[PDB]
Write a protein that binds this ligand. Structure first.
Ligand SMILES: [Cl-]
Length: 333
C-alpha cells in the first residue's frame, strides 16, 4: 500500500512546489530560498540539486524557486521552472519590480543540467501595466500546452498570464483582467487540461477561469462551479490529475484539497473537497501525484514557511490525501 506520508529529509528545503515524474521515479521540488531545483528519489532517499547560474543562492538571493511543471505527464521531455522575486510576497518589504525568471530544462536532470533557455518578465510586466493599468507580479506557476508553449500565472497586482513560446524567443501578454482588491488579486495557480485543450487558472477574481490556447491572446472564460467553492482567500497552486481518460484538477486552499471535474469543457465544473489537520499550518501550496508501480495516490506539498531560510527543519512530509477527491460521479443512475 502507499504510505500515509513521504518524509523528505532535506534540511531547509522549503518546497514551495513539488511534482512527481512517474517515468523517472523522482520528485522535482522547489528549494525556495536557495533558488534551485532539488531532485528526490523516494525509494532510495538520495537527492541532489540543480542550480541556475546567477539565480541560485545560499538562501538570500533576489530570486526564489516557485513553480515547477512537466511538458507531459509521462515520458516528459522537459521541465519548466518559475522563479519569483524574493520581495514579491514579502508584504513588509514588498516590490513589484524585482527580477523574476523562467527556465526550460531537458529531462532527465543531472547535477550539471543547465537551461535550454531562460527568459525574464520585466518587459511583459511593463506591457501589462501599460495596457491594463496595474503591474502584475508574483509569478507562481506555469502550464504547458500540447506544443510546449508556456503560460505563467501572476498572483499579485492584477490577474495576468504571460505566454512564453516553446523556443523561448517570445514572451507576450496572453491574458489579463481586472482584480477585485486584496493582497492577492491575481491567479494563484494555472494548469493545462489536454482533454479539453484548455488552460484553467485558480483563484483571484473567482475559483476557476478557463482560456483557449490557439491564439496569441485569450479572453478569460469564467467557469461556473456547480456547488459551493467557498472563500477565495488562501488559494495556492492547481494541477491536472489524469484519471482514466479524463482530467480531475486539484487545487490547494489550506487545509483543503479541492478538486474539479467538467463534462462541458470548462463551461462548468463539479467540486469535491478533502482536508487533513496537518495542512492547517504547514505551508500547504500544491498537490502532487505519486505512483508505486500501478498504485497511485495524491499527496499534499507543504513548504513550512515558518522555518525561514535557515530555521533547521530537516523533515518535509508529503501527506497522503483521501482518494475521494479523484472519484467523481456526474450523478445514482
Ligand atoms: Cl515575482
Amino acid at each position: 500500500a502507499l504510505p500515509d506520508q513521504i518524509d523528505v529529509k532535506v534540511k531547509n528545503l522549503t518546497p514551495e512546489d513539488t511534482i512527481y515524474d512517474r517515468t523517472r521515479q523522482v520528485f522535482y521540488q522547489s528549494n525556495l530560498y536557495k533558488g534551485r531545483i532539488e531532485v528526490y528519489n523516494p525509494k532510495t532517499q538520495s537527492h541532489f540539486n540543480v542550480v541556475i547560474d546567477g539565480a541560485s543562492s545560499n538562501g538570500d538571493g533576489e530570486q526564489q524557486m516557485s513553480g515547477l511543471s512537466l511538458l507531459t505527464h509521462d515520458n516528459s521531455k522537459r521541465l519548466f521552472a518559475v522563479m519569483k522575486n524574493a520581495k514579491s510576497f514579502n508584504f513588509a518589504d514588498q516590490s513589484s519590480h524585482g527580477a523574476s525568471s523562467f527556465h526550460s530544462f531537458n529531462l532527465p536532470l543531472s547535477e550539471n543540467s543547465k537551461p535550454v533557455w531562460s527568459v525574464n518578465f520585466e518587459k511583459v510586466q511593463d506591457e501589462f501595466e501599460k495596457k491594463a493599468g496595474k503591474r502584475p507580479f508574483g509569478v507562481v506557476q506555469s502550464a504547458q500546452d500540447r506544443d510546449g508553449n508556456s503560460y505563467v500565472a501572476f498572483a499579485l497586482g492584477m490577474p495576468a498570464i504571460a505566454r512564453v513560446s516553446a523556443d523561448g524567443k517570445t514572451v507576450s501578454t496572453f491574458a489579463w483582467e481586472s482584480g477585485n482588491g486584496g493582497q492577492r488579486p491575481g491567479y494563484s495557480g494555472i494548469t493545462f487540461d489536454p482533454h479539453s485543450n484548455k488552460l484553467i487558472a485558480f483563484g483571484g477574481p473567482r475559483a476557476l477561469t478557463a482560456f483557449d490556447v490557439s491564439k496569441p491572446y485569450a479572453w478569460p472564460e469564467p467557469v461556473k462551479i456547480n456547488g459551493d467553492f467557498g472563500t477565495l482567500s488562501g488559494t495556492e497552486k492547481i494541477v491536472t490529475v489524469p484519471v482514466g481518460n479524463e482530467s480531475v484538477l486539484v487545487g490547494a486552499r489550506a487545509p483543503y484539497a479541492i478538486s474539479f471535474r467538467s463534462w462541458d469543457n470548462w463551461k462548468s465544473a463539479n467540486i469535491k473537497k478533502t482536508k487533513r489537520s496537518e495542512l492547517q499550518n504547514s505551508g500547504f501550496t500544491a498537490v502532487a501525484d505519486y505512483y508505486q508501480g500501478s498504485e497511485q495516490g495524491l499527496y499534499a506539498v507543504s513548504a513550512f514557511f515558518d522555518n525561514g531560510a535557515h530555521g533547521g527543519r530537516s523533515d518535509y512530509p508529503l501527506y497522503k490525501l483521501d482518494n475521494s477527491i479523484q472519484n467523481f460521479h456526474h450523478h445514482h443512475h
